[PDB]
Design a protein around this ligand. Structure first.
Ligand SMILES: [Mg+2]
Ligand SMILES: [Mg+2]
Ligand SMILES: [Mg+2]
Ligand SMILES: [Mg+2]
Ligand SMILES: [Mg+2]
Ligand SMILES: [Mg+2]
Ligand SMILES: [Mg+2]
Ligand SMILES: [Mg+2]
Ligand SMILES: [Mg+2]
Ligand SMILES: [Mg+2]
Ligand SMILES: [Mg+2]
Ligand SMILES: [Mg+2]
Ligand SMILES: [Mg+2]
Ligand SMILES: [Mg+2]
Ligand SMILES: [Mg+2]
Ligand SMILES: [Mg+2]
Ligand SMILES: [Mg+2]
Ligand SMILES: [Mg+2]
Ligand SMILES: [Mg+2]
Ligand SMILES: [Mg+2]
Ligand SMILES: [Mg+2]
Ligand SMILES: [Mg+2]
Ligand SMILES: [Mg+2]
Ligand SMILES: [Mg+2]
Ligand SMILES: [Mg+2]
Ligand SMILES: [Mg+2]
Ligand SMILES: [Mg+2]
Ligand SMILES: [Mg+2]
Ligand SMILES: [Mg+2]
Ligand SMILES: [Mg+2]
Ligand SMILES: [Mg+2]
Ligand SMILES: [Mg+2]
Ligand SMILES: [Mg+2]
Ligand SMILES: [Mg+2]
Ligand SMILES: [Mg+2]
Ligand SMILES: [Mg+2]
Ligand SMILES: [Mg+2]
Ligand SMILES: [Mg+2]
Ligand SMILES: [Mg+2]
Ligand SMILES: [Mg+2]
Ligand SMILES: [Mg+2]
Lengths: 87, 70, 116, 101
RNA sequence: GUGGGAGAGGGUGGUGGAAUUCCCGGAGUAGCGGUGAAAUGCGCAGAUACCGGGAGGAACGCCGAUGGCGAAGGCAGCCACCUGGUCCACCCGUGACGCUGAGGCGCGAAAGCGUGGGGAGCAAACCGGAUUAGAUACCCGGGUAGUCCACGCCCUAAACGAUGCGCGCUAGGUCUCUGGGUCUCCUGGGGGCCGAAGCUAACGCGUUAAGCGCGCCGCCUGGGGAGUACGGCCGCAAGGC
């Protein structure tokens, strides 16, 4: 699974300032963690479909948040994409 | 014809090792009794069922009995 | 050629016939009887009267081995499953315990079309 | 890692030497998969509701462990390999949900 | 975000008992089976009924619900692992990041196709027995594909709530599943049944709209010919759009 601890480290990493939880950044990062977990889980268990739909949905969300960042602050976006290894 | 829960004290519904109490929820045969007979809740009954099934696999409670008299 | 005394009685009753098997405490049969054991041929085998006659025949046959007590075990639903037990009671065999052992599955096998 | 309960039902025919041996193997395998032992209850000889391996009785060992979750099924496989062990059930622990409080 | 929750939601591996069939053994004889009646069939190479042992496949009784989960198809023994969705509380973070969605891609009951396994029970086709004017059927005795597993195809359906998705608004009562609460009851999120206003051709619908509205997609334009022909695309084929 994803421990509270792992999650926390991810957030205190991607926080924009102490106490930041729900930023576009932190959200995208969290999503990314969940994405990688799922894909690794779908390498074996290829026949798990319903889960895969879950993944489609996650990916969709991630892309929308990124699209938002892209529009608003292109710098924060570039930084995120580099830091996380995406798009 | 009272209800099973009616006569009993505090008891763990998740405890599959306790036969003494679990046996009270079974039938003349091995059957798990209806809620009407157990006087249980939806959730309660749902838990009892799985706990009993555990005890059956575990060798403590019967899957079936034979009907006497008749 | 046994002298079994105390014993076990099995009534297997279907809609098409009734058959009664008398055995010893270990369960090995002594004698048996059925609707066809006696004169009956067709549907008349699954008659309750037939079942009476069969139970009786088996009980007398077992009287030959000198049975006294018996333990009744009833499998199946069928016409005159009861009449079997009834005749078996007044058969002079003193009936200790009656029991219903009819097998039922936890859903193993798809039934015949007539049975679904 | 995570908290489980190990149920073990073995041959009631055992003397003390062999019982202690089988138990010694249970322990060895437990600590060999990384399973720490919180609490143990030995209930022992009990009358089964149905015959198991032709026996009306069974001898019960109950353990409560903290073990790596990726190792649990291997652990249980290990306990089953033994001849004398006729039942193994390992269960994730649960808070004691109760009725008639 | 944090802290709680319910669940046959999915995938992998294990595993438990009941039943059927078959095999081995014991005991035991003259029939069993089956029907409206029968017959075929099985049984003296010993069946049926009964007890003990073993092998194997398939499906999970009670619990079980007018219940639950899922986007749908669909999902129910027990255990562990891997994993999706979702609800509630707190009112903490971001600051419109929203809705819909032609094309695309993925999923998609059953039957069906391919390669290799497996095969207990059921069983299209088939072989028999009856019934009948005939019986190519209904009923009875057999039985192959198939049903099961893996991998790959197929893309259909009364795939039904015959009701596209989202948001706001418009009396209540009653039963129920699952959260939270000062747990009489209140308050969220599902499932149901009556009903206000209203709608409807009527039947009916009615805060789970078929009411009042806004947004976007799909779709219809008399019946038959016809889901046919032709062309294109997809399919190994059957065939599908
Ligand atoms: Mg007959
Ligand atoms: Mg073993
Ligand atoms: Mg949470
Ligand atoms: Mg499930
Ligand atoms: Mg034999
Ligand atoms: Mg012959
Ligand atoms: Mg012959
Ligand atoms: Mg012959
Ligand atoms: Mg047998
Ligand atoms: Mg075989
Ligand atoms: Mg039911
Ligand atoms: Mg879960
Ligand atoms: Mg989850
Ligand atoms: Mg705020
Ligand atoms: Mg601000
Ligand atoms: Mg959409
Ligand atoms: Mg399909
Ligand atoms: Mg299919
Ligand atoms: Mg095939
Ligand atoms: Mg094949
Ligand atoms: Mg047939
Ligand atoms: Mg024919
Ligand atoms: Mg003919
Ligand atoms: Mg006619
Ligand atoms: Mg057949
Ligand atoms: Mg073929
Ligand atoms: Mg349609
Ligand atoms: Mg419309
Ligand atoms: Mg409450
Ligand atoms: Mg739902
Ligand atoms: Mg409601
Ligand atoms: Mg209501
Ligand atoms: Mg109404
Ligand atoms: Mg509303
Ligand atoms: Mg609406
Ligand atoms: Mg026309
Ligand atoms: Mg067509
Ligand atoms: Mg043309
Ligand atoms: Mg064409
Ligand atoms: Mg072609
Ligand atoms: Mg066609």
């Amino acid at each position: 699974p994803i421990t509270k601890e792992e999650k926390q480290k991810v957030i205190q990493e991607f926080a924009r300032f102490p106490g930041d939880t729900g930023s576009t950044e932190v959200q995208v990062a969290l999503l990314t963690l969940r994405i990688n977990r799922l894909s690794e889980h779908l390498k074996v268990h290829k026949k798990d479909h319903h889960s895969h739909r879950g993944l489609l949905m996650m990916v969709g969300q991630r892309r929308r948040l990124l699209r938002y960042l892209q529009r608003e602050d292109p710098e924060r976006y570039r930084a995120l994409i580099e830091k996380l290894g995406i798009r | 014809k009272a209800k099973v829960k009616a006569t009993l004290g505090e008891f763990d519904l998740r405890d599959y090792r306790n036969v003494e109490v679990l046996k009270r929820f079974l039938s003349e045969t091995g059957k798990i009794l209806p809620r009407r007979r157990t006087g249980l809740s939806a959730k309660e009954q749902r838990i009892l069922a799985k706990t009993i099934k555990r005890a059956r696999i575990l060798g403590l409670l019967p899957f079936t009995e034979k009907l006497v008299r008749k | 050629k046994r002298q079994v005394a105390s014993g076990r009685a099995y009534i297997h009753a279907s809609y098409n016939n009734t058959i009664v098997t008398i055995t010893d405490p270990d369960g090995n049969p002594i004698t048996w009887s059925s609707g066809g054991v006696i004169g009956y041929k067709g549907s008349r085998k699954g008659t309750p009267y037939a079942a009476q006659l069969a139970a009786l025949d088996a009980a007398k046959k077992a009287m030959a081995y000198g049975m006294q007590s018996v333990d009744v075990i009833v499998r199946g639903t069928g016409a005159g499953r009861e009449q079997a037990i009834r005749a078996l009671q007044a058969s002079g065999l003193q009936v200790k315990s009656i029991v219903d052992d009819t097998p039922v599955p936890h859903n193993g096998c798809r039934p015949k079309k007539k049975f679904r | 890692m995570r908290r489980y309960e190990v149920n073990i039902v073995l041959n009631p025919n055992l003397d003390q030497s062999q019982l202690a041996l089988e138990k010694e193997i249970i322990q060895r395998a437990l600590e060999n998969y990384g399973a720490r032992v919180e609490k143990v209850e030995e209930l022992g000889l009990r009358r089964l509701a149905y015959p198991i391996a032709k026996d009306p009785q069974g001898y019960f060992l109950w353990y409560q462990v903290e073990m790596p979750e990726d190792r649990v099924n291997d652990l249980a496989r290990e306990l089953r390999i033994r001849d004398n062990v006729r039942r193994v059930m390992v269960v994730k622990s649960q808070e004691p949900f109760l009725a008639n409080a």
